[PDB]
């Protein structure tokens, strides 16, 4: 059959630091839900352990959180519209530089930041007219690094 | 400190350009793969979509966004590390898509599943490595597929 | 001031595995491509290597690391933006490699150059975009090739 | 043998987004790197562009597309397998870019070359591998850098 070259989306990032495992999630349908899991409490200090990305039913993935630290606080984000940017803070946690906070911005609403808004700032932006259709990164016990896939609207 | 994070090497993709690019590289091993078809096992099976998953949770389905009703499904319980995939590419309703697929682990072979006809593809990786994810293009069907690999 | 760095979308590769992965995406436009072959134009041409270059200095050569002497070269001076690449894939001395290649801009066509016979390949990008670089696999010959692209 | 082609694993990028995405992964070893600066060796050197090469043919220059006059260059003749890169990121004329860089091979070290200040970066690869190419973002300066690596 004709070998019609298949395409791979452009990427922005990753930011943060190297983690034991590389991960990627780029669903065919829009990303519509994000669940961030923390240890600690919102009245004290939040420690981001894992992130869960989902697209409609069935499509879902959880990165970070393979360690023993119990989860004690979850934040559910229901995305309305197209994500165009994500930002947050990077800092050391129990020995590793990881994503400590995170904020999702769509062309309609703003969600976050969530977590410990302290440390080194990061900002994943894409050219005007594009949208984020996925995420990839490095992770282990925690979320070491994050990057995004993007394509024209 | 900005300590460069890594991205696994890739093999492929093979097949044809499709409407959407897709990627699924879970942090835990792949353990289950569900293939959905139209047609029938007694005659000819038409591969429509593929579902990849890793326990617990972690799942994705590619292809199958169209109106064609599904009529059959085959669940592959992955035993071991996937070291290669192969199959056939043939035309279907106007497009060239993945028509058959076989998963090979050091422990056993699964497939080929689907329709054994068309152009053969073969995704092999260097010895000592294992496939830890898949990526590709898809729309109504599975247009293209490729794999992520790393040291075992 | 401190945003994450970007990587261009990719289309491909087409062809088959080769010993070395190669990549060339210069900061300035691809304006000269030199194709090196064995054999002769009055007979059949065997593509051995390809040289990509961007104005002075920026240059790379893939394939052709074998001992087979080159007896024919085709120089292509690209006028505008390359939006498509096509050609043929076929066996050469026990290897499936790029045998033929044609470059297409918005107003001109260059080639095909080489041996027009085998399995056809085509690298197309979404309208409004342009090819800004290439990647693939190579060794003695040119095993596979893919393109980097971005908006005009 | 019709096997899918492979793409080397990646580490990075580090630094900040830049106008152009760039990539250079030659088939043969990288045996020479030239760093071009403005300023002076006695005071502060400002990294403006980096030139990578393998043999007198494969060469690429990233950064330096601006009118800023160069005033110093440093040539690094790599002896062994480059297994690590490091340096500093800092502001220069309103841009966060690579200001310092150091190359480490399986034999010796080269650098740090450039200005001391800013955020450190480190591109390290798993044991047993080596850097076979580099990619990143650039404009008037070198905005971001990453490495392609494979088993040595
Ligand atoms: C506790 O160590 C584990 O978790 C951290 C954090 O996510 C990873 O960086 C590391 O590679 C993994 O082995
Ligand atoms: C029927 O057309 C749809 O499905 C095919 C196949 O999977 C895709 O290639 C195409 O882009 C999409 O629009
Ligand atoms: C002759 O063998 C060499 O050249 C061929 C073709 O380029 C490559 O596929 C192969 O890996 C390399 O070792
Ligand atoms: C002067 O501006 C130019 O050079 C800087 C630094 O290289 C790039 O970041 C920017 O995108 C490009 O347009």
Residue numbers in the entry:
A (entry chain B): 2 to 154
B (entry chain A), C (entry chain D), D (entry chain C): 3 to 154
What does the paper say about this structure?
Structural and functional analysis identified IPO as a member of the JRL family but with a different tetrameric association. The monomeric IPO from residues 1 to 154 shows a typical β-prism fold found in the JRL family, with 12 β-sheets (β3-β14) and 2 additional short, extended, N-terminal β-strands (β1-β2). Four IPO protomers form a compact tetrameric association by swapping their extended N termini from residues 1 to 10. Thus, the wound-inducible protein IPO from sweet potato has versatile carbohydrate binding properties and might play a role in plant defense.
The crystal of IPO–Me-Glc was determined to be a monoclinic space group P21. The Matthews coefficient and solvent content was 2.26 Å3/Da and 45.5% for 4 molecules. In addition, the resolved structure of IPO–Me-Glc formed a tetrameric association. We analyzed the tetrameric association of IPO–Me-Glc. The 2 extended N termini from monomer A in blue and monomer B in purple swap with each other. Consequently, a larger buried interface between monomers A and B is 1,522 Å2. In the chain A of IPO–Me-Glc, 9 hydrogen bonds are formed by the residues Gly21, Tyr97, Gly141, Trp142, Tyr143 and Asp145 of IPO and the atoms O1, O3, O4, O5, and O6 of Me-Glc. The atom C7 of Me-Glc is involved in the methyl carbon (Me)…π interaction with Trp142 of IPO. In chains B to D, the Cd2+ atom forms 5 coordinates by the O atom of the carbonyl group of Asn19, OG atom of Ser18, and 3 water molecules. One of the 3 water molecules forms a hydrogen bond with Asp145.
